Design an enzyme around this catalytic site. Sequence first.
Site, mmCIF file in Angstrom:
data_model
loop_
_atom_site.group_PDB
_atom_site.id
_atom_site.type_symbol
_atom_site.label_atom_id
_atom_site.label_comp_id
_atom_site.label_asym_id
_atom_site.label_seq_id
_atom_site.Cartn_x
_atom_site.Cartn_y
_atom_site.Cartn_z
ATOM 1 N N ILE A 1 0.821 -1.217 0.000
ATOM 2 C CA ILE A 1 0.000 0.000 0.000
ATOM 3 C C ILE A 1 0.859 1.273 0.000
ATOM 4 O O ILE A 1 0.441 2.332 -0.485
ATOM 5 C CB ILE A 1 -0.878 0.090 1.275
ATOM 6 C CG1 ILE A 1 -1.717 -1.152 1.487
ATOM 7 C CG2 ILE A 1 -1.826 1.268 1.213
ATOM 8 C CD1 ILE A 1 -2.496 -1.072 2.794
ATOM 9 N N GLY A 2 2.047 1.180 0.585
ATOM 10 C CA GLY A 2 2.897 2.343 0.731
ATOM 11 C C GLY A 2 4.306 2.027 1.185
ATOM 12 O O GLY A 2 4.602 0.903 1.600
ATOM 13 N N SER A 3 5.176 3.030 1.113
ATOM 14 C CA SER A 3 6.571 2.860 1.494
ATOM 15 C C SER A 3 6.946 3.943 2.483
ATOM 16 O O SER A 3 6.297 4.982 2.536
ATOM 17 C CB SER A 3 7.473 2.934 0.261
ATOM 18 O OG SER A 3 7.222 1.852 -0.626
ATOM 19 N N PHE B 1 10.608 3.578 7.351
ATOM 20 C CA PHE B 1 10.429 2.517 8.329
ATOM 21 C C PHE B 1 10.329 1.163 7.624
ATOM 22 O O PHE B 1 10.772 0.142 8.161
ATOM 23 C CB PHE B 1 9.155 2.773 9.139
ATOM 24 N N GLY B 2 9.781 1.160 6.410
ATOM 25 C CA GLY B 2 9.533 -0.080 5.691
ATOM 26 C C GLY B 2 8.428 0.061 4.663
ATOM 27 O O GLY B 2 8.224 1.143 4.097
ATOM 28 N N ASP C 1 1.361 15.519 13.326
ATOM 29 C CA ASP C 1 1.378 15.375 11.878
ATOM 30 C C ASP C 1 -0.040 15.224 11.292
ATOM 31 O O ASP C 1 -0.251 14.498 10.334
ATOM 32 C CB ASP C 1 2.285 14.187 11.495
ATOM 33 C CG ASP C 1 2.786 14.249 10.038
ATOM 34 O OD1 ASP C 1 2.470 13.323 9.248
ATOM 35 O OD2 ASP C 1 3.511 15.219 9.686
HETATM 36 C C1 LIG Z 1 -7.365 2.121 1.984
HETATM 37 N N1 LIG Z 1 -6.821 1.893 3.297
HETATM 38 C C2 LIG Z 1 -5.460 2.018 3.498
HETATM 39 O O1 LIG Z 1 -4.628 2.171 2.609
HETATM 40 C C3 LIG Z 1 -5.063 1.918 4.923
HETATM 41 C C4 LIG Z 1 -3.730 2.005 5.250
HETATM 42 C C5 LIG Z 1 -3.414 1.897 6.586
HETATM 43 O O2 LIG Z 1 -2.079 1.976 6.945
HETATM 44 C C6 LIG Z 1 -1.705 2.296 8.253
HETATM 45 C C7 LIG Z 1 -1.091 1.341 9.031
HETATM 46 C C8 LIG Z 1 -0.680 1.607 10.314
HETATM 47 C C9 LIG Z 1 -0.874 2.861 10.829
HETATM 48 N N2 LIG Z 1 -0.441 3.122 12.149
HETATM 49 C C10 LIG Z 1 -0.815 4.263 12.859
HETATM 50 O O3 LIG Z 1 -1.649 5.102 12.534
HETATM 51 N N3 LIG Z 1 -0.105 4.353 14.024
HETATM 52 C C11 LIG Z 1 -0.181 5.466 14.865
HETATM 53 C C12 LIG Z 1 0.960 5.867 15.515
HETATM 54 C C13 LIG Z 1 0.916 6.959 16.349
HETATM 55 C C14 LIG Z 1 -0.256 7.650 16.539
HETATM 56 C C15 LIG Z 1 -1.392 7.243 15.880
HETATM 57 C C16 LIG Z 1 -2.664 7.980 16.069
HETATM 58 F F1 LIG Z 1 -3.745 7.256 15.673
HETATM 59 F F2 LIG Z 1 -2.860 8.317 17.380
HETATM 60 F F3 LIG Z 1 -2.721 9.120 15.321
HETATM 61 C C17 LIG Z 1 -1.359 6.149 15.048
HETATM 62 C C18 LIG Z 1 -1.482 3.823 10.045
HETATM 63 C C19 LIG Z 1 -1.898 3.557 8.763
HETATM 64 C C20 LIG Z 1 -4.402 1.706 7.517
HETATM 65 C C21 LIG Z 1 -5.699 1.632 7.079
HETATM 66 N N4 LIG Z 1 -6.062 1.733 5.797
#
Ligand SMILES: CNC(=O)c1cc(Oc2ccc(NC(=O)Nc3cccc(C(F)(F)F)c3)cc2)ccn1
Length: 262
Positions: A25-27, A30-31, A140
């Site tokens: 889905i993305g880069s 971090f990975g 962010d």
């Molecule tokens: C079409 N749907 C998608 O392409 C898609 C992509 C997708 O990727 C992700 C995977 C993991 C995360 N991890 C994350 O927010 N961690 C986090 C860390 C600190 C603070 C917060 C807070 F929530 F507090 F802001 C969150 C995010 C996105 C997830 C769902 N759908």
Amino acid sequence: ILLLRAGLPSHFHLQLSEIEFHEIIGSGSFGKVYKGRCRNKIVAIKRYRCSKSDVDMFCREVSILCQLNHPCVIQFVGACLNDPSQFAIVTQYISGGSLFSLLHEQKRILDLQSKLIIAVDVAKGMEYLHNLTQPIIHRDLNSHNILLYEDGHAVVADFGEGNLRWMAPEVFTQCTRYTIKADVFSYALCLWEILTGEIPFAHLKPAAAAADMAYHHIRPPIGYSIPKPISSLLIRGWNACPEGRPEFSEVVMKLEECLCNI
Ligand SMILES: CNC(=O)c1cc(Oc2ccc(NC(=O)Nc3cccc(C(F)(F)F)c3)cc2)ccn1
């Protein structure tokens, strides 16, 4: 590092075999970010590339994620913690994409009620983050970090992407910890972006936009068409004095009051 392994609740521990990987889905630095299947759910797996800098960041994210329980904030499925080669983070997959894609790529026209639901959901999720016993500055918040369900509700996530009297204001700012009010500035730009369906300072590259806001005190144009309670939230929201910006409790309360009239 293993301190996390002990501190993390049982049901959140995952084995790498229990995670099915389908597409990328993305880069990031971090990975890679995968779409997959895990525990009979469609999930999103944030997989990591084992040196100190990146690892300290790995524990931080997991530490944040096992605390989050709110319908307007991303859901943690669990994490894999066996070896550094197998470090992974699993969350829900919100299938409707980012608020950014909705507005600027798919270029969809929204109802005012449609717009206000997203706004409130973001506001609700942030109020949640800010009312933790140890509050979290998102730092962010933007239209890329706001995900949407197919039903138009949204979820807040993070893609992981001297003597003061004579001091210069840009030097003063680097001695001052930013607070959660920084998230209110960010929200307000997003809220303007929802209402206008425009990227903030669309005619500029990002760093130019940032300096125009900081050095030259430019904000996006608040048209007269924009509803009385909302436009007020904007002005105060993106005020240069952090203390002068509202709490999310007020944003939510006022935005919800608007829903009742649309
Ligand atoms: C079409 N749907 C998608 O392409 C898609 C992509 C997708 O990727 C992700 C995977 C993991 C995360 N991890 C994350 O927010 N961690 C986090 C860390 C600190 C603070 C917060 C807070 F929530 F507090 F802001 C969150 C995010 C996105 C997830 C769902 N759908």
